[PDB]
């Protein structure tokens, strides 16, 4: 309304406002010092407050884009430091904002962040809490200029939570370090998802994006009408389209809007939104997005009678098109939370192909009469990979599963860097631990999640790059995972002679290097050296001497060279 800054200050609260303002500026003006950003934020904050006090006061009626750009253009160094960004200041809105978006440099090429010693950190923390956090918030933001600021701020609050707890402890390190890793991990993942989703929307187009979204929202809100699910799909697609284009202010208004709508109609979407919708506004969009699947309504009628049996299937296909198809996906999805989204899409694609062929035929009804049987193999295929790998993980346990996987994939693609190999396989085994703990019903959605993050990591690794995996990485996200599972051994390295998990990683690095130089040797032979190696190290760590490691290792090398060839 009037004083919308006033509206956003009052909605966010002063502290969250200040944090977000900082992040926003940090992201555009990446090469400005900390002390300057703080002053910019304090200027904005003090102004904000005047508008709250009186909505009628000078400039309070401006939009947030005007006030934002105005503030950027006050900057003294703006031409010296950022060059053309200064030319944006000559333009009126909304061209000005646009012009500023262009000049956000994704890779600031600034020094990579050194984690200090936990002592020094916790002191910095205790000396000035605010400065310490803000500083880190600043440093992260200016390196990730495309990170939804509210999301950044959420991590920031868990950083603070970590410090407040782990620092008052006998081992700051025992408590603080895992959390810091976990957070940095989660954030890097979060980014990866966002980036993927945008690449896909651009690459595969809006339609594909909407298909995917219909599937996911139908599972999530199965008590919602087809017409409501379609509404939500539309709005979500616009928010994603907006957000990808990189404007924080529009992105956030559209997320706020979508959240607000969903909460106004909760009763018609999900029982599960009750608490989400009492959450403070920065929290609510984020909370809704991670809400659990609702119960699917009891005794829903058969999918087949509307699509397999009822007349007008080709009339409605031909009249409604994507809506008819959209409805199929919706109706299949809401009845099948046990499925991964990519599966539901494969099914949908199959039905749609069936209809293209059949509705072109003399007797369509005959030709599509038994389409549902075409689903049976598509559904069984992932179901069985789950069962089979889950049992092997249950038999073997995380560590040695990772090594079972380590062999499998070095054999299938030995060209790839073993580090990448060690890390992919290690992750996959963690995926296994994550997923097989769930009820079989909840495994396949769980897998699809944790695989997509792993498979993507691998795929973005292949930028500085093995020819075969590019096909899989440049497929539709639907058929990525099956294209990968379709790998077989390459079939077509010299011998160099040259601590908990880190020791394990070294052992694995060795295992891959063994399988490299020697791809051919069987699995009994791998088992042998693995055991003789387990025996060598236990022997020499136990021995009082370094000499034992030296003499045994030549013996172990020689012993296994013989047992090779």
């Amino acid at each position, epitope marked *: 309304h009037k004083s919308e800054v006033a509206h956003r200050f009052k909605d966010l609260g002063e502290e969250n406002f200040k944090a977000l303002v900082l992040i926003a500026f940090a992201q555009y003006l990446q090469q400005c010092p900390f002390e300057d950003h703080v002053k910019l934020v304090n200027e904005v904050t003090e102004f904000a407050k005047t508008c709250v006090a009186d909505e009628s006061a000078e400039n309070c009626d401006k939009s947030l884009h005007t006030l934002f750009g105005d503030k950027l253009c006050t900057v003294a160094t703006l031409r010296e430091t950022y060059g053309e960004m200064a030319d944006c200041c000559a333009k009126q809105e909304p061209e000005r904002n646009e012009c500023f978006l262009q000049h956000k440099d994704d890779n600031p090429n600034l020094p990579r962040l050194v984690r200090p010693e936990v002592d020094v950190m916790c002191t910095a923390f205790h000396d000035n809490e605010e400065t310490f956090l803000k500083k880190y918030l600043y440093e992260i933001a200016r390196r990730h200029p495309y990170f939804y600021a509210p999301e950044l701020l959420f991590f920031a609050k868990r950083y603070k939570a970590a410090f407040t707890e782990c620092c008052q402890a006998a081992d700051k390190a025992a408590c603080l370090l895992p959390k810091l890793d976990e957070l940095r991990d989660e954030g890097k993942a979060s980014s990866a998802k966002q980036r993927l989703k945008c690449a896909s929307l651009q690459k595969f187009g809006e339609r594909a994006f909407k298909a995917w979204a219909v599937a996911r929202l139908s599972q999530r809100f199965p008590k919602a009408e087809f017409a409501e699910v379609s*509404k939500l799909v539309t709005d979500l697609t616009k928010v994603h389209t907006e957000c990808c284009h990189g404007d924080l202010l529009e992105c956030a208004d559209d997320r706020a809007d979508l959240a607000k709508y969903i909460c106004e*109609n909760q009763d018609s979407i999900s029982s599960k939104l009750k608490e989400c919708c009492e959450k403070p506004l920065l929290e609510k969009s984020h909370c809704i997005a991670e809400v659990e699947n609702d119960e699917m309504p009891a005794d829903l009628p058969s999918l087949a009678a509307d699509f397999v049996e009822s007349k007008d299937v080709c009339k*409605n296909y031909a009249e409604a098109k994507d809506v008819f198809l959209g409805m199929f996906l919706y109706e299949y999805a809401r009845r099948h939370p046990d499925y991964s989204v990519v599966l539901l899409l494969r099914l949908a694609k199959t039905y749609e192909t069936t209809l293209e062929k059949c509705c072109a035929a003399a007797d369509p009804h005959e030709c599509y009469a038994k389409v549902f049987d075409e689903f049976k193999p598509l559904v069984e295929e992932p179901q069985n990979l789950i069962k089979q790998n889950c049992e092997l993980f249950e038999q073997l346990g995380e560590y040695k599963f990772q090594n079972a996987l380590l062999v499998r994939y070095t054999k299938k693609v030995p060209q790839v860097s073993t580090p990448t190999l060690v890390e992919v396989s290690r992750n996959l085994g963690k995926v296994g631990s994550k997923c097989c703990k769930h009820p079989e019903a909840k495994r396949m959605p769980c897998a699809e999640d944790y695989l997509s993050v792993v498979l993507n990591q691998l795929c973005v690794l292949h930028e500085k790059t093995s020819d075969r995996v590019t096909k899989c990485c440049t497929e539709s996200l639907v058929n990525r995972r099956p294209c990968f599972s379709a790998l077989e051994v390459d079939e077509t390295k010299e011998f160099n002679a040259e601590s908990e998990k880190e020791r394990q990683i070294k052992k694995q690095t060795a295992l891959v290097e063994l399988v490299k130089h020697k791809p051919k040797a069987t699995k009994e032979q791998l088992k042998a050296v693995m055991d003789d190696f387990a025996a060598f190290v236990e022997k020499c760590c136990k021995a009082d001497d370094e000499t034992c490691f030296a003499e045994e290792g030549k013996k172990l090398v020689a012993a296994s060279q013989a047992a090779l060839g």
Partner: nanobody
Amino acid sequence: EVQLQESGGGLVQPGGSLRLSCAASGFRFSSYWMYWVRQAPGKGLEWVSAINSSGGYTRYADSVKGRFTISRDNAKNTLYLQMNSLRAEDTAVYYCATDSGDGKRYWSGEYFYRSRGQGTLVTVSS
């Protein structure tokens, strides 16, 4: 059993007004999207407009945009359609429809529906 009953139809001059009402029962009206469809003499069914479960989310066919205002009163299970700036070509039978389910589906040209009423005749001429 879904039950709809339209009313308020009748004859008006070009550029006149009407207010169609529709009485719902047999389903939880307040939790479902409601539509207005129409069929001109000799023509196919047209989608006219749509409203969400709560209200405050309305859509309109291009032709009627700016002219007709759909709304609902959930307290009364009544769907309204306020027809202003009427035209000769707006002469048709106006049904109200819903997708309350477990039933056969039909295409209105923007939304599938499941049940519609008897209709109300609107004539616009002279």
